[PDB]
C-alpha cells in the first residue's frame, strides 16, 4: 500500500530494491554501504536516505549501541529535509525518529518531532494521540490534557483518547469524572486501550466511589494477562515469583536483617523521634493521592537503591546499621523510610507498582488501640520492637483511629527468589 517513491526515485527503483533486499536478508553491513553509495550518487533521494537510516537502526540493535542509534535519528531527520518527500515516507520517517528518541530519553526531543508531525499532518488523529503520550512521558499532564480534549472535540468516539483522558482525570483526583472515560475507552477496543494501567485505575476509581463493579474489571484485566491475580495487580513484574500477601521472617530468608531491626529498634525509634522534635520538615506528606482522609508523612533515607546523604545526617546511627544489609540498601525497586500516621487517617486500598519487593514494617511507637493494616483478606496490627512483612503488590489498606501518633520504620527488600543477576539489571522504580 504505502507509496514512498517520488518521481525521481521511480527511475532508480531497481537499485533501491537491490539494496533494501540485502537489508531484509540480515546483511546489515552490506546494505548500509549499498544505501550509502545510493545516497552519494543521489543526495536528494528520500528513499536512499530512508534506507540508510533504517540500516543504521538495525545496526544499533545488532550492536546495542547508543551512539549509532543517535546517528539513525539524525538520518531519519535528514529524510524529512529533502525535496519532494512522499507523505507516507515523511510520516513513517519522523514517527520512528520520535519512537527511537523516546527510547533514549530525549523526550524533550521526541516532543518536538511529534509537534512537527502534527503541524505537517493536522487531520491525523493518531499523531495527536502519539503526541499526548509524548507529553505524559515527560510528566506534563497539563499539556497532555488539552491534547486529548482537542482530539475529543473532533473525534469523541476515539477510544485511545478516552482512556488517556480518563487516566489524566483519575490522576487529578477527579475520580467520578474519570470513570465513564476509562470505561467507554477500554470498551471501544481500539488499538492501545487494552493496557493494564486503565484496568487498574478504573477499578480503583470505582472502589473509591463505592461502586462494587470495580472487581468485575479487576477480573477482566486478569483474564487478558495484565494482572497476576485479582488481588495482586502490580504492573512491573518478574513472572513466577512466590506470591502471598503475608510472609514470616524465615520464609523470606532475611533473618539477619530482621534480628538486627528487632534488637536495635530503640535507636531507630529515638532518631525518628528526634527528627520529629527538631527537624520535622524532613517528613514529607504522602503525595500519591493514597489518603481518603487525615495526615500521613514519610522521612526517606534510601530510594531506588541510593542513600540520601542529608537525610542520613538526621538518622546517622540508623543509616550506619542498615549499611550492612544490601538486600535492602540496594533494592532499586524499594525504599527505606520512617512513616508517621496520625488519628483520623484512612489509606485507600492500593497496590504497589512491582512484585519484585517485599516490605518490612518495624513498630516504633504503636498506640494500643486504633491502628491496623489489611493486606488482601487479612488484617493485622503492629507491635513495638517487632517486624511484620507483607507483599505490597497485593491490595492493602490502613486505618489510624487512635488518640496519638503512630510511627513505624519501613524497609523494602528484593524478592528472595530473584537472582543476583536480576537484582543488578532490573530498572529502578
Amino acid at each position: 500500500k504505502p507509496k514512498l517513491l517520488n518521481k525521481f526515485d521511480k527511475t532508480i527503483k531497481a537499485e533501491l530494491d537491490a539494496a533494501e533486499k540485502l537489508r531484509k536478508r540480515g546483511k546489515i553491513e552490506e546494505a548500509v554501504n549499498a544505501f550509502k553509495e545510493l545516497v552519494r550518487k543521489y543526495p536528494q533521494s528520500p528513499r536512499a536516505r530512508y534506507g540508510k537510516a533504517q540500516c543504521e537502526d538495525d545496526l544499533a540493535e545488532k550492536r546495542r549501541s547508543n551512539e549509532v542509534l543517535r546517528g539513525a535519528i539524525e538520518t531519519y531527520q535528514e529524510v524529512a529535509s529533502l525535496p519532494d518527500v512522499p507523505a507516507d515516507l515523511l510520516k513513517l520517517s519522523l514517527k520512528r525518529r520520535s519512537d527511537r528518541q523516546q527510547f533514549l530519553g530525549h523526550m524533550r526531543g521526541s516532543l518536538l518531532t511529534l509537534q512537527r508531525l502534527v503541524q505537517l499532518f493536522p487531520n491525523d488523529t493518531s499523531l495527536k494521540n502519539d503526541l499526548g503520550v509524548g507529553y505524559l512521558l515527560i510528566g506534563d499532564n497539563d499539556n497532555a490534557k488539552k491534547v486529548y480534549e482537542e482530539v475529543l472535540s473532533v473525534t469523541p468516539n476515539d477510544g485511545f483518547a478516552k482512556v488517556h483522558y480518563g487516566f489524566i482525570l483519575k490522576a487529578q483526583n477527579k475520580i467520578a469524572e474519570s470513570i465513564p472515560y476509562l470505561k467507554e475507552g477500554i470498551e471501544s477496543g481500539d488499538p492501545g486501550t487494552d493496557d493494564g494501567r486503565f484496568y487498574f485505575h478504573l477499578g480503583d476509581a470505582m472502589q473509591r466511589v463505592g461502586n462494587k463493579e470495580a472487581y468485575k474489571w479487576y477480573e477482566l484485566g486478569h483474564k487478558r494477562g495484565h494482572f497476576a491475580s485479582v488481588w495482586q495487580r502490580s504492573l512491573y513484574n518478574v513472572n513466577g515469583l512466590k506470591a502471598q500477601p503475608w510472609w514470616t521472617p524465615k520464609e523470606t530468608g532475611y533473618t539477619e536483617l530482621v534480628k538486627s531491626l528487632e534488637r536495635n529498634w530503640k535507636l531507630i525509634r529515638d532518631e525518628g523521634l528526634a527528627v520529629m522534635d527538631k527537624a520535622k520538615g524532613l517528613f514529607l506528606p504522602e503525595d500519591e493521592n493514597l489518603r481518603e482522609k487525615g495526615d500521613w508523612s514519610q522521612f526517606t533515607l534510601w530510594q531506588q537503591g541510593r542513600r540520601n546523604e542529608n537525610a542520613c545526617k538526621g538518622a546517622p546511627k540508623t543509616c550506619t546499621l542498615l549499611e550492612k544489609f544490601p538486600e535492602t540498601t540496594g533494592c532499586r525497586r524499594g525504599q527505606i523510610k520512617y512513616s508517621i500516621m496520625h488519628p483520623g487517617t484512612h489509606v485507600w486500598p492500593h497496590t504497589g507498582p512491582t512484585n519484585c519487593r517485599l516490605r518490612m514494617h518495624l513498630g516504633l511507637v504503636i498506640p494500643k488501640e486504633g491502628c491496623k493494616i489489611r493486606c488482601a483478606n487479612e488484617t493485622k496490627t503492629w507491635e513495638e520492637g517487632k517486624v511484620l512483612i507483607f507483599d505490597d503488590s497485593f491490595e492493602h489498606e490502613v486505618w489510624q483511629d487512635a488518640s496519638s501518633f503512630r510511627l513505624i520504620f519501613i524497609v523494602d527488600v528484593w524478592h528472595p527468589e530473584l537472582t543476583p543477576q536480576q537484582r543488578r539489571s532490573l530498572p529502578a522504580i
Partner: peptide
Amino acid sequence: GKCKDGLGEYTCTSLEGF
C-alpha cells in the same frame, strides 16, 4: 515524579538508552 507506594504515573521507569 516517581512510583513509590502506588502506580499513579503514566510510566514508572525512566528510559535512558540500551
